[PDB]
């Protein structure tokens, strides 16, 4: 909010409309990523009131009405696992609220539990969960009688395996390494961007009001120009870092969308 600096910056050109355009581009790209990953369900599917899925137990991953956030137990555990307005920097809120994303995943989960892979193809067609698991065993090459003869054992294995995830998440630290790394990288970028302001950049002083105050305008212009070029360079560096990291996260988000489609909605024969 310095007028003389405003003029000296104005004479540089269209750099800032360009930087703003890049940042707003990655901003809307993020919403596109989330919407592409999670919004693969046409219509949100309610799960039936009584859970009798052939001995399998989905209480952990299914939403609990008691919780105010209305997200599953493991989702709340994952939220607690991670630990997530100064001068011209603003953080725009994501278009899809966390509750909306939880609702997306609840819909997908109810659909895959009740209707198998039919809901991804089109109208959701419901099969008893045991018979659907038999379908999937036929998919992997094992005949379907193997499930029915061993249904109780398979149910116990699945329940205990889900139970192990809760221990792994609650006790083992740094389970959510990649997501925490994303948060830390973004915090690092914003923090260093703010730190660059204190940097002198070869002028007599970093604080702009001081350099304005104790020099004549003809001489002060040069020092202000050094400050402007340094700060603009730092901001350009932050923008290009954001662009590259946004490309990397877009690749990861496309992978998540493909895995959501090819694995949640349907059974996949691609090994590993």
């Amino acid at each position: 909010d310095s007028t003389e600096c405003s003029n000296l910056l104005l004479q540089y050109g269209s750099f800032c409309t360009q930087l703003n355009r890049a940042l707003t581009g990655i901003a809307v790209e993020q919403d596109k990523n989330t919407q592409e990953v999670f919004a693969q369900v046409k219509q949100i599917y309610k799960t039936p009131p009584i859970k009798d899925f052939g001995g399998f137990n989905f209480s952990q991953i299914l939403p609990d009405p008691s919780k105010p956030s209305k997200r599953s137990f493991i989702e709340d555990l994952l939220f607690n696992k991670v630990t997530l307005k100064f001068n011209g920097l603003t953080v725009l809120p994501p278009l899809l609220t966390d509750e909306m994303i939880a609702q997306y995943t609840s819909a997908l989960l109810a659909g895959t539990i009740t209707s198998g892979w039919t809901f991804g193809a089109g109208a959701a067609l419901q099969i008893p969960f045991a018979m659907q698991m038999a379908y999937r065993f036929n998919g992997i090459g094992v005949t379907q009688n193997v499930l029915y003869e061993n249904q109780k054992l398979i149910a116990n294995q699945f329940n205990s395996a889900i139970g192990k995830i809760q221990d792994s998440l609650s006790s083992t630290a740094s389970a959510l390494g990649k997501l925490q790394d994303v948060v830390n990288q973004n915090a690092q970028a914003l923090n260093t961007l703010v730190k660059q302001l204190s940097s002198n950049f070869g002028a007599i002083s970093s604080v702009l009001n001081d350099i304005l105050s104790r020099l004549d305008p003809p001489e002060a212009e040069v020092q202000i120009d050094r400050l402007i070029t340094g700060r603009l360079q730092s901001l350009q560096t932050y923008v290009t870092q954001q662009l590259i990291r946004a490309a990397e996260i877009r690749a990861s988000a496309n992978l998540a969308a493909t895995k959501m489609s090819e694995c949640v909605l349907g059974q996949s024969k691609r090994v590993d």
Binding site: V28, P48, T114, S115
Partner: protein, 225 residues
């Protein structure tokens, strides 16, 4: 927006037209009591009003407020993180104040497209709009000139924080909490199966960019000529 887009027609969407910062009023200066006897003029302080202030040679613009943080008897002004002044003790009354950057944020319009209509709904991002038809607070900022509805539809223009705006009938811009999708509970049972008795074949379009324009810039002719 016509100006910042360099056009006389803008498409349906939300465009960050400008930025909005509350301007400071009645700048104040303070310096400790002149007990030993050039001198430095000092004036009274204010609260909860974006003001340019000078505290012991430190110049800054913000809203001064009461702060629960206690300094130590020697510390003058404090920095929470990243070398940003966040608290400051006045030299006269020996009292600590917290500084908050007075509200600022992008102003972005919501327009359904010029040929549809000339109505616009302004969105002042992350500004609790107690200050500058119907003014509706949303978790993404303040919305001026958009009616709020209770029912929900599919998202048309992304405002943010789970809220979208659209132009609908008379002939007004409405903001709503977007509907994720239709709600149905497929009738599960342990001995019930739904088998298709017919089918529709469907051709759909998937569009994919594969190339760009092969631009080549003569470095020397562009730089010097």
């Amino acid at each position: 927006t016509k100006c910042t887009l360099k056009s006389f027609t803008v498409e349906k969407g939300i465009y960050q037209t400008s930025n909005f910062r509350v301007q400071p009023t009645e700048s104040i200066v303070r310096f400790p009591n002149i007990t030993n006897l050039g001198p430095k003029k000092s004036t009274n302080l204010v609260k909860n009003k974006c003001v340019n202030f000078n505290f012991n040679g430190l110049t800054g613009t913000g809203v001064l407020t009461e702060s629960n943080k206690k300094f130590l008897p020697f510390q003058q002004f404090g920095r929470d993180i990243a070398d940003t002044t966040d608290a400051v003790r006045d030299p006269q009354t020996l009292e600590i104040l917290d500084i908050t950057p007075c509200s600022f944020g992008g102003v972005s319009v919501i327009t359904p497209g010029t040929n549809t209509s000339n109505q616009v709904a302004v969105l002042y991002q992350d500004v609790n709009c107690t200050e500058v038809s119907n003014v509706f607070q949303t978790r993404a900022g303040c919305l001026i000139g958009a009616e709020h509805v209770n029912n929900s539809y599919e998202c048309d223009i992304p405002i943010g924080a789970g809220i979208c705006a659209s132009y609908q009938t008379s002939q007004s811009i409405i903001a709503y909490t977007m509907s994720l999708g239709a709600e149905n509970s497929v009738a599960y049972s342990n001995n019930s199966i739904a088998i298709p008795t017919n089918f529709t074949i469907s051709v759909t379009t998937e569009i994919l960019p594969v190339s760009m324009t092969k631009t080549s810039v003569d470095c020397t002719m562009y730089i010097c000529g």
